[PDB]
Amino acid sequence: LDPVQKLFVDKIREYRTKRQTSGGPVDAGPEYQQDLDRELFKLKQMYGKADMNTFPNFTFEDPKFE
């Protein structure tokens, strides 16, 4: 409704204020950040072990002279 779009406005306002700022997450404090870190570790194992932000190097192979 339109008296219920009066509430919808309210939320839209808070979203921008946060996004162009942050306090933790604006409304979240350390608590968010801490939770992430618990999920973030387990995902490394699911996703590999390193190179997550940096291109993988490679190596090349050899033989036996016969």
Partner: protein, 58 residues
């Protein structure tokens, strides 16, 4: 190996945004849910549209 790096960042931002979205949402809604007696006329528009039901259903 190239994919593995990227999709982690995407996935984290996605889940992170939902854990912002929910957390802001409940906090905003749990703060501001008060002005219904201050503006009655959300039930007056209920009775307005509700009269356009009580008339305009049949």
């Amino acid at each position: 190996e190239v994919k593995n790096r990227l999709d982690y960042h995407i996935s984290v931002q996605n889940m992170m945004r939902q854990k912002e979205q929910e957390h802001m949402i409940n906090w905003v809604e749990k703060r501001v849910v008060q002005s219904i007696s201050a503006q009655q006329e959300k039930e007056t528009i209920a009775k307005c549209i509700a009269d356009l039901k009580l008339l305009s259903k049949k």
